[PDB]
């Protein structure tokens, strides 16, 4: 591909799931890609699989990991054009009274501050390249979700932060956007479903929450990321919904 | 009541349903209320029932009816402080291919242009009184609805128009706001349900579309209108949702 | 290009401005494009310029023009994969009291019902092809604009209609999306500015309404349309903002 | 007043500014009010001033302070009907590169986790009383703000959390809503302005960011809170904008 040829992209949590889909999309568009992940298994295999992708072990909650990720990217490829902040986690369903402040802090540390820290360290290089930032948020930041107060809160923060940063970085020509996926079939979706009393029913329900009648694919999020990086040159501070229409209309959720 | 004492309010479609609830709320707050409706039966009874409410027969799609409504209101009460554009209609469910341009035009004529025409004729008086406009839109203007392309379109227009007009009238101190109800139990809701194969099931489904587990009441929309008129003095161009949370979260509406 | 190779696209108002940018984007992506426009001058030249684009004279407010547009497209190319409803108009600034119901109706006829009519006639063919609809709305439908009550209302309607139709057509695999541009430098923008007391100042103000410090280009809207057609396969009922960030933050628009 | 007679309300950060306005609104509506604040000066005076208001020293970032606040409220008044999470802080303008992860964490601790902790400890009592939660968020959580990445992020989180919690608590009849003010003239606004090179200009600019041409008052936020507590019985998970229209239209913030 040539849509993003000559560009260098860092994808956090790129070892599996949505992140791996985004990695593949950017490789297919001609970019060189750095796969950041805290686990080795998926990302190492992906590096072997994909010419133009390399793997760097990095836990985005560890500031020295992230500093090394940025400096290794520059040392090896000489520029940085796009950072995709995809690393994140959805805890199992938890009733509000079953949550804790400390668990909330830990989830904020990954879903929000990990995105903040890489963005901050990358911005000097993105400014030189007139590059861009893509944050992977969630539809449920906008519309809410049951049994997920901490998670919903972290994604509300990511989406809002995206707009703040877009404002700050617009004078430098650096665009900052986010993608808000809905149900995307990933290993995390599979893991969460396996915890439920009836996994198969949870998966059917998840497929049917969308007017389109299926969950989304990592490749579909990847395509949206490539669009934001390579062609959305008048888009900054937007929230691109990749949800199959889940937010549309009424569903199951006289006046007394 | 004294929250809106000494004020004069016009409520279109005030003979039944949401409009009658709004009429009652304003009377209870101390205002004098003009009940506008194209049908006599409900509004005439309401005038007899409520001291401080009077009924004026007026079809908001007929410009001379509306001109007379405004001039009779001023002749009888000497001022005009609030116009509530509630008159409107939801056609039966219709698939897109079952709609027509002419039916769409007719629905626009009521739901949108009727609101426009009264607002336009009232604004000289609202400017003198630093009064305000309240448009009754719908949640489905924001989130969509199935088998209702014309209706959804008219309410998307009302909500957007509310913001445009708020901008234009802000220099004059005239606030313009809208209320977007969700399922409110009214005669129109009952009529629509009676068309369905199973009315009781349609009503149960409608009650359950809300996290709160019931439909809303006309009095609850009425209370929101009184708030916007009497106490929301720093609110203009807002969309106040009165929906029981229907827009929140996923509902019923693997990656292949 | 090959992103949308073998596909057939109809672009209304494709003779100049945003529509011509969209035409060019789709041609560059490998599609065959039908340029619909009520004026001959731009579209005829564009047909001569672009292999793979042809021009059909058609006024989208004339139902028989639109019926012929669809049947000629099928007769000449054998399928229809995407309809881009771009034709529309922004009247000069008008204070609310300077508007009329009949001017409002005429603007609704173009900006809203023209989009409705082509969509309706195209949908049988889009269903066979699992094609998609792209409506060109406006940011000001969402956030409002001064001295433009009718225009704002028409675009609020288009955006809402997009969501309604997405719901109705999702069972058939037909996606329905809209693009909401902000200030895009087009002949209409130039014409409107030329009416102002100071055209150059109006244009400078328009450039600065965006954090990015410039207006957008037709090609940038075109790229977003190609993305929605060719790669956004899990997107339906979305509003894709192409605005340069104009909706972000505070601007020029103690407690007494 | 009698709108909220017999009810017990806790207002955090009630010693001055918006919180004190909310305290006064609830007292005027007939409620008994607990003023929570980390500083004694304003709240102690307010307790002396207002029959029906009492002051409890409490730092919402200190879990044992908050536990004692709830148990003292129940011991002294026998019930709890509404919690208003108003305590929060806006740091001085800070460019993204001038922020730190640790400052971000500290701001999250106040603006987000303080709201979480009181809500969590109050919910058993709110469930018994079918009470409600009101969170004071900010417009800039929704639209962004320049030189305020941490602040914007915290308020995006509060607004999203409000919707999540509304979903979780709806089966228990507990409503959870938020108010998103824009520029409200408060001591914090005055303090921030005094840091600027030209305070008077910053204040003029702040007044003019609103179509209404002034900043809002604490009493106006207070009225909106009383409405949400006492009359918005079909509202849950909403974001009530109290902004003077700042989010409407274009402002100051050719295609090359
Ligand atoms: N799957 C969905 O339906 C869905 C929906 C909306 C949003 N999202 C978001 O998309 C993102 C990816 O989700 P997914 O479903 O692909 O999850 P996943 O669990 O399948 O994959 C996430 C990847 O990130 C890595 N990761 C986790 N913590 C990390 C850390 N500290 N440092 C580096 N890498 C780390 C994991 O090792 C893994 O390879 C997350 O931000 C999630 O919130 C997912
Ligand atoms: N009921 C709901 O669930 C619901 C939900 C969202 C929005 N709404 C909106 O609320 C409004 C009232 O709805 P409702 O459910 O109370 O309906 P309703 O049918 O029960 O009452 C509407 C009233 O308006 C009158 N009316 C109709 N056309 C008129 C005209 N041309 N001139 C004057 N009066 C006219 C009717 O005669 C009637 O008295 C409408 O704008 C509707 O779109 C209703
Ligand atoms: N230019 C902007 O800043 C801007 C911003 C937001 C939205 N938009 C929307 O984008 C669309 C295109 O705007 P533009 O700026 O390119 O305008 P334009 O005037 O430059 O071009 C519009 C084209 O549509 C054609 N057209 C008009 N009426 C028609 C009809 N009845 N049938 C067929 N063709 C018809 C015109 O002849 C012209 O070729 C419109 O829907 C407009 O509302 C424009
Ligand atoms: N003023 C505005 O324009 C504005 C706009 C939008 C949102 N807000 C929000 O409204 C709320 C109040 O703002 P304000 O302008 O009135 O501020 P303020 O500084 O004038 O008052 C805040 C009050 O909260 C108290 N407080 C601070 N930290 C506390 C803690 N840890 N525990 C207990 N009390 C604490 C302070 O002592 C003070 O009395 C905040 O959440 C703020 O983000 C304000
Ligand atoms: O056979 C693999 C595979 C990889 C990607 C594909 F698209 C595919 O079709 C297959 C493979 C091999 C080694 C490790 C992992 C792995 C990936 C992701 C996460 C993990 O934990 C892993 F162990 N996969
Ligand atoms: O990873 C999930 C997710 C799904 C949608 C998103 F928008 C998102 O950001 C994340 C997910 C997967 C399986 C079940 C649930 C779930 C359902 C229902 C309630 C819950 O608490 C759940 F966690 N979530
Ligand atoms: O007995 C009535 C009534 C009216 C309002 C009430 F709240 C109530 O408890 C009862 C009544 C009497 C005459 C006409 C109508 C009427 C109203 C509304 C619409 C109509 O079509 C009507 F005929 N009602
Ligand atoms: O009057 C209705 C309505 C309900 C919610 C709103 F937000 C609103 O503005 C209007 C209504 C009543 C009964 C069934 C349906 C319906 C359901 C499902 C599909 C439909 O096409 C329906 F008409 N609607
Ligand atoms: O020289 C032209 C041109 C056309 C497109 C280009 F990108 C370009 O660089 C140049 C041209 C020639 C004839 C008619 C029109 C025309 C187009 C659009 C609208 C009109 O009214 C027209 F007369 N243009
Ligand atoms: O064509 C315009 C437009 C610009 C933005 C959009 F989002 C849109 O859909 C349309 C436009 C061009 C020049 C001036 C004005 C204008 C400014 C200020 C006030 C007005 O009434 C204006 F017409 N508008
Ligand atoms: O004279 C006061 C006052 C209080 C409220 C009013 F509405 C009023 O018109 C006046 C006063 C007295 C003691 C402490 C504080 C105080 C309040 C709020 C914050 C503080 O830091 C304070 F010292 N005020
Ligand atoms: O307390 C503020 C605030 C104002 C609006 C809100 F919606 C809100 O939640 C908070 C405030 C006060 C004075 C200046 C600034 C400011 C302006 C411009 C840029 C900034 O970084 C600022 F802090 N803010
Ligand atoms: Na490789
Ligand atoms: Na009477
Ligand atoms: Na050609
Ligand atoms: Na007291």
PDB file of C-alpha atoms in Angstrom, chain B residues 96-97 99-101 104-105 108-109 112-113 116 120 127 141-147 149 152-153 156-157 160-161 163-165 167-169, chain C residues 96-97 99-101 104-105 108-109 112-113 116 120 127 141-147 149 152-153 156-157 160-161 163-165 167-169:
ATOM      1  CA  UNK B  96     -39.283   4.014   4.369  1.00  0.00           C
ATOM      2  CA  UNK B  97     -40.702   2.709   1.100  1.00  0.00           C
ATOM      3  CA  UNK B  99     -43.682   6.928   3.043  1.00  0.00           C
ATOM      4  CA  UNK B 100     -44.340   9.687   0.537  1.00  0.00           C
ATOM      5  CA  UNK B 101     -42.903  13.123  -0.062  1.00  0.00           C
ATOM      6  CA  UNK B 104     -43.526  14.074   4.783  1.00  0.00           C
ATOM      7  CA  UNK B 105     -44.415  17.650   3.800  1.00  0.00           C
ATOM      8  CA  UNK B 108     -43.251  18.945   8.483  1.00  0.00           C
ATOM      9  CA  UNK B 109     -46.090  21.444   8.234  1.00  0.00           C
ATOM     10  CA  UNK B 112     -41.891  22.015  12.360  1.00  0.00           C
ATOM     11  CA  UNK B 113     -43.553  24.911  10.560  1.00  0.00           C
ATOM     12  CA  UNK B 116     -41.910  28.197  13.504  1.00  0.00           C
ATOM     13  CA  UNK B 120     -42.236  34.134  14.761  1.00  0.00           C
ATOM     14  CA  UNK B 127     -38.778  40.500  23.337  1.00  0.00           C
ATOM     15  CA  UNK B 141     -34.610  13.272  16.840  1.00  0.00           C
ATOM     16  CA  UNK B 142     -31.248  12.688  18.539  1.00  0.00           C
ATOM     17  CA  UNK B 143     -30.942   8.853  18.469  1.00  0.00           C
ATOM     18  CA  UNK B 144     -33.292   7.781  15.671  1.00  0.00           C
ATOM     19  CA  UNK B 145     -36.282   5.419  15.651  1.00  0.00           C
ATOM     20  CA  UNK B 146     -37.352   2.585  13.364  1.00  0.00           C
ATOM     21  CA  UNK B 147     -40.270   2.960  10.922  1.00  0.00           C
ATOM     22  CA  UNK B 149     -38.215   8.546   8.893  1.00  0.00           C
ATOM     23  CA  UNK B 152     -37.567  11.593  13.258  1.00  0.00           C
ATOM     24  CA  UNK B 153     -36.621  14.165  10.606  1.00  0.00           C
ATOM     25  CA  UNK B 156     -34.215  16.634  14.372  1.00  0.00           C
ATOM     26  CA  UNK B 157     -35.247  19.893  12.713  1.00  0.00           C
ATOM     27  CA  UNK B 160     -31.594  22.192  15.624  1.00  0.00           C
ATOM     28  CA  UNK B 161     -33.929  25.140  15.015  1.00  0.00           C
ATOM     29  CA  UNK B 163     -30.319  26.248  18.868  1.00  0.00           C
ATOM     30  CA  UNK B 164     -30.326  28.550  15.820  1.00  0.00           C
ATOM     31  CA  UNK B 165     -33.101  30.668  17.282  1.00  0.00           C
ATOM     32  CA  UNK B 167     -28.393  32.313  18.977  1.00  0.00           C
ATOM     33  CA  UNK B 168     -30.480  34.894  17.119  1.00  0.00           C
ATOM     34  CA  UNK B 169     -32.591  35.915  20.119  1.00  0.00           C
TER      35      UNK B 169
ATOM     36  CA  UNK C  96     -35.652  35.138  12.021  1.00  0.00           C
ATOM     37  CA  UNK C  97     -38.204  37.871  11.366  1.00  0.00           C
ATOM     38  CA  UNK C  99     -37.671  34.532   7.004  1.00  0.00           C
ATOM     39  CA  UNK C 100     -40.933  33.182   5.639  1.00  0.00           C
ATOM     40  CA  UNK C 101     -42.740  29.879   5.871  1.00  0.00           C
ATOM     41  CA  UNK C 104     -38.487  27.623   4.614  1.00  0.00           C
ATOM     42  CA  UNK C 105     -40.586  25.121   2.643  1.00  0.00           C
ATOM     43  CA  UNK C 108     -36.692  22.007   2.959  1.00  0.00           C
ATOM     44  CA  UNK C 109     -37.637  20.869  -0.531  1.00  0.00           C
ATOM     45  CA  UNK C 112     -34.169  17.541   2.918  1.00  0.00           C
ATOM     46  CA  UNK C 113     -36.764  16.176   0.511  1.00  0.00           C
ATOM     47  CA  UNK C 116     -35.207  11.740   0.730  1.00  0.00           C
ATOM     48  CA  UNK C 120     -36.037   6.218  -1.670  1.00  0.00           C
ATOM     49  CA  UNK C 127     -30.336  -3.441  -1.196  1.00  0.00           C
ATOM     50  CA  UNK C 141     -27.344  21.213  12.376  1.00  0.00           C
ATOM     51  CA  UNK C 142     -25.718  20.003  15.605  1.00  0.00           C
ATOM     52  CA  UNK C 143     -24.490  23.286  17.192  1.00  0.00           C
ATOM     53  CA  UNK C 144     -26.632  25.974  15.551  1.00  0.00           C
ATOM     54  CA  UNK C 145     -25.694  29.073  13.543  1.00  0.00           C
ATOM     55  CA  UNK C 146     -26.819  32.696  13.662  1.00  0.00           C
ATOM     56  CA  UNK C 147     -29.093  34.189  10.974  1.00  0.00           C
ATOM     57  CA  UNK C 149     -33.008  29.272  11.165  1.00  0.00           C
ATOM     58  CA  UNK C 152     -29.984  24.904  10.428  1.00  0.00           C
ATOM     59  CA  UNK C 153     -33.399  23.220  10.640  1.00  0.00           C
ATOM     60  CA  UNK C 156     -30.828  18.961  11.792  1.00  0.00           C
ATOM     61  CA  UNK C 157     -33.447  17.014   9.844  1.00  0.00           C
ATOM     62  CA  UNK C 160     -31.683  12.768  12.285  1.00  0.00           C
ATOM     63  CA  UNK C 161     -33.145  11.185   9.143  1.00  0.00           C
ATOM     64  CA  UNK C 163     -30.088   7.680  11.877  1.00  0.00           C
ATOM     65  CA  UNK C 164     -33.734   6.692  11.315  1.00  0.00           C
ATOM     66  CA  UNK C 165     -32.946   5.288   7.890  1.00  0.00           C
ATOM     67  CA  UNK C 167     -32.154   1.666  11.630  1.00  0.00           C
ATOM     68  CA  UNK C 168     -34.674   0.741   8.935  1.00  0.00           C
ATOM     69  CA  UNK C 169     -32.101  -0.446   6.392  1.00  0.00           C
TER      70      UNK C 169
END
